Structures are given as structure tokens and as C-alpha cells.
């Protein structure tokens, strides 16, 4: 499913992401925009053989199991396919663990490179939040 911008903002907010670990809703919408272009089905293989899954491109090296990332951890205790669903609950709950890991949203390279320091509030503009 490809979310609309305000549709995603509302679902992230419903699932507790607004200001989670201090990151305002616009940070999460921005991260999703540049990680997956709001597409829950996005996948991207990494050089180390791991794969990033879903609207927030969660990595199989640490966070989910895809059965093909030797020596990976599965810290969110989920199959990576669960991160591809139209319902973003699993992605949100795993993102809450990632952002709590010590590095904040710097765990998302696209957030660091394209959202951090910017006017992330623009990403929830005009939404009935």
C-alpha cells in the first residue's frame, strides 16, 4: 500500500509515534517519505546481504528475520514480511525499538541526510491531526 502523506501521519500518530523518544511526527513522516516514498512494500537489498523492509526500511541485519541474513539478530522478533503489510503496526512497533537503541533516528540514514535539521513540520502541514 502506498500511503498518502496525511494518511500516514494519522496512522503514525494513532500508533504512538508523535514525539516518541522526542521526535515529532514530522520527523517520522519525513523519514518514511525518503526511506520508502510511503510504500509499505518497499524492499532494498544492502551490500552486506541484509535487506531493508517496509515504510521505514527496517534492516534484516538486526531487527527482523528474513531467513537469508546469516548471523542476524531479529531484535523485533518478527518476520521481515510483517513489515510489508498495509497495516503499519509492526513497522511502528519495531521503529520504536530502533529509535530507542541509543542513536535516535540516526539509525535511518535517509533521516539523517534529508530530514534532520530541516523543517520537518512541513510534512504534516494541512493534515487533520
Chain residues in the site for Cl ion (CB under 5 A): 5
Between 71 and 102, whose beta carbon lies closer to Na ion?
71
| Contact code string over 68-107 relative to Na ion, x by CB under 5 A | -x--x-x------------xx-------------------
Q: Helix, strand or coil for residue 3?
A: coil
Report the partner that residue 5 touches, choosing among Na ion, Cl ion, none (CB closer than 5 to 8 A by kind).
Cl ion
**Strand partners of residue 65:** 79
CA atoms lying within 13 Å on the CB side of residue 52: 18
CA distance 129 to 124: 8
Annotated binding site: 101
Amino acid at each position: 500500500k502506498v500511503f498518502g502523506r496525511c494518511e500516514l501521519a494519522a496512522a503514525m500518530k494513532r500508533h504512538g509515534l508523535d514525539n516518541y523518544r522526542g521526535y515529532s511526527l514530522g520527523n517520522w513522516v519525513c523519514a518514511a517519505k525518503f526511506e520508502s516514498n510511503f510504500n509499505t512494500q518497499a524492499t532494498n537489498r544492502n551490500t552486506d546481504g541484509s535487506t531493508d523492509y517496509g515504510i521505514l526500511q527496517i534492516n534484516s541485519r538486526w531487527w527482523c528475520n528474513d531467513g537469508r541474513t546469516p548471523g542476524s539478530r531479529n531484535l523485533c522478533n518478527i518476520p521481515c514480511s510483517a513489515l510489508l503489510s498495509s497495516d503499519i503496526t509492526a513497522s511502528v512497533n519495531c521503529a520504536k525499538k530502533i529509535v530507542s537503541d541509543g542513536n535516535g533516528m540516526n539509525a535511518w540514514v535517509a533521516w539523517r541526510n534529508r530530514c534532520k535539521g530541516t523543517d520537518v513540520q512541513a510534512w504534516i502541514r494541512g493534515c487533520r491531526l
